[PDB]
Amino acid sequence: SLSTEATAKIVSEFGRDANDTGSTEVQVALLTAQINHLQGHFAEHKKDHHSRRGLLRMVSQRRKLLDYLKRKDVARYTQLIERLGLRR
Amino acid sequence: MLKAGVHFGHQTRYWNPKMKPFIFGARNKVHIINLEKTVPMFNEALAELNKIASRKGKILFVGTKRAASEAVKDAALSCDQFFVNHRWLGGMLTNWKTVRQSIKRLKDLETQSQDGTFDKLTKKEALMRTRELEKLENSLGGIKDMGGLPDALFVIDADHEHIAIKEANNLGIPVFAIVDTNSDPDGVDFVIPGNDDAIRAVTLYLGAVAATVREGRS
Amino acid sequence: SMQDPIADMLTRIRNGQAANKAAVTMPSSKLKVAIANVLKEEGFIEDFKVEGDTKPELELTLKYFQGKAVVESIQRVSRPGLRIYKRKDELPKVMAGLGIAVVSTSKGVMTDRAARQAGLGGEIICYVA
RNA sequence: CGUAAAGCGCACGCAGGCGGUUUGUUAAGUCAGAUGUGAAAUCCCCGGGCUCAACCUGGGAACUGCAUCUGAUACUGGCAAGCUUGAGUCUCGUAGAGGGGGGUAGAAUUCCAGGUGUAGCGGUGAAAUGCGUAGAGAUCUGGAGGAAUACCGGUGGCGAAGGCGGCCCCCUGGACGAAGACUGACGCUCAGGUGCGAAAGCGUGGGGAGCAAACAGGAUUAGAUACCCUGGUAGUCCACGCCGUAAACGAUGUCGACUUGGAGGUUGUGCCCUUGAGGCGUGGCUUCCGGAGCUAACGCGUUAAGUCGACCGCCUGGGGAGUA
Prior knowledge:
This is part of a larger assembly, with chains A (88 residues), B (218 residues) and C (129 residues).
Chain A: H1 4-14, H2 24-43, H3 49-70, H4 74-84
Helix pairs in contact in A: 1-2, 2-3
Chain B: H1 35-53, E1 61-62, H2 71-78, E2 83-84, H3 96-114, H4 124-139, E3 153-155, H5 162-171, E4 175-179, E5 190-193, H6 199-213
Parallel strand pairs in B: 1-2, 1-3, 3-4, 4-5
Helix pairs in contact in B: 1-6, 2-6, 3-4
Chain C: H1 5-17, E1 23-27, H2 30-42, E2 45-51, E3 57-62, E4 74-76, E5 85-86, E6 101-105, E7 108-110, H3 112-118, E8 122-128
Antiparallel strand pairs in C: 1-3, 2-3, 4-8, 5-8, 6-7, 6-8
The structure holds one RNA strand of 324 nucleotides.
């Protein structure tokens, strides 16, 4: 998947601290990082239909977590999707 | 505790999960029967078995495998009781009717044999008839003087003699079996977790049973 | 996923009676302890015991009368797919009275005899026959 | 609903259905009571009158409902707060024909050029067509080209399914294991919808060694539009798009829980003299046989076709017809 240094950087940016690596913002940001990186991979190749299935699992799982965090705390939702530049 | 000196259980292979209450089960892939469970079981079997033995009943030891022979002939015949030591015929209890006339032919042919006309009229047919007495004598050996179907049944291996257990359950006869860890307590009314194929174990074992049979009211 | 833990409990007891099992453990809850108290009270199980602190574990010591098993047929009636709420007049008797039906009434989890005597119906959880 | 008709080819997922566990509040569902109403006749019950009966009739019950008010709060729902046993994230490794792109290697077939060499070669049940003194076949050397990747190779592995087999690099998906940390029900299923989906086929552009529908010849045969033989085009191969199906099959939907065993395979991990190709456990996936149970039987049998729960799909005699 993603680099150890990259995952550590995103956990450090979005968590309450390091070791808070399962929080909803953190998981969303890690999924987001990998989705964008693989936008770069699937612009090329384009017939890697197996890897894409992994990618659509990432998209769907991000969506589930955004729905959770939307119906738990909406302020965290707006700050989160504001910071990640998603939602369009 | 130790009446059962030397057997401690057997049968690594084809062990049966229904023998799980009776297994201590440690050493070298083989299963050890919990003989601290066997001793109350075997004392109960001696209790009810002596109880029917004192009511003037017939017991029918069953000893087809070797060397249960002649240990079942020795133990049954040490009492005034009955036995099967060679191949147990399929249906000598549940059609005893037809087996009654085979026993009748054994009696008529031994009476004809050692007393009557045995040298009469042929040598070849006389040899034929004598080996009919060997076949009818080793198959219908102990049971030939029974004259009823018996009041209990004592089998020495439950899986090897499943036919006799199946028939005595079919007829309402109390089955007294020494099961091993491969056997199954089918309809054995008085199960005894022991060792079926050790001659020390079955001579000790039948020694105790034949000891408690030959105490009636006396 | 687990969506009916009560039917899971009754499944544990059917398959424990069917396997000559001495005792049955499961995760515990308030409703399972209520039902289990009704079953001990009516004589279908021998005892229950809830252990653990942070993850409670209900344990039902089962009954066997003869070689046969005591709980002859336990069924789940008000499943989550379709819930069944009977009044005090519609409240059924199982095996013509020889077998209780555990109904959750507002006063608590009772039997059919006890809640028909109390004068109030409710949600009929399970037939124990 | 394995084989009788019936499990979508496989997944992702919206609306929908269902939802672990604890406490508090509400009381919508649920329950109890009350009130209003539910026309009369009819049905039912207990009586009465026609000589009886049908019939007529008195009183009740009933009209299983709806609305409102009063309560109960166990279950379900709403709301608030949690909790970790479900789900997920992070750390470290492991195995793998998982995918896509690029390169390369060795055997072999065909073709071309050349040397030797000479009368057959090939083929079949037998033959003939075919190739061959214009020198075939055999054999050696050099070259070109395309496709596939022996041995390993294994009821072995990976993948949702279709499927994926030289070796190397690059990009990339998933699974599993060990200890610990974190989030805290974030879950399950899924009509419409969307995606992937062997082979054959279609479109455009390449490629084309072998194999080979069509086709042609030779046989066989009563005939032979076949099986067999000799050739042989599309196709099979590549790029991009379409199609959208298969005995797409474990003829077995997905997810979760429980219920006796035995022998293996494969991939992790922990412990013990590792005193070796050991001993004891603990996971993941998988093969064979079998117990209870189930099953019309056959068989399935902890990877269920057993015992349950959630949601979906489908069936309703054969044909006509999966056709118009």
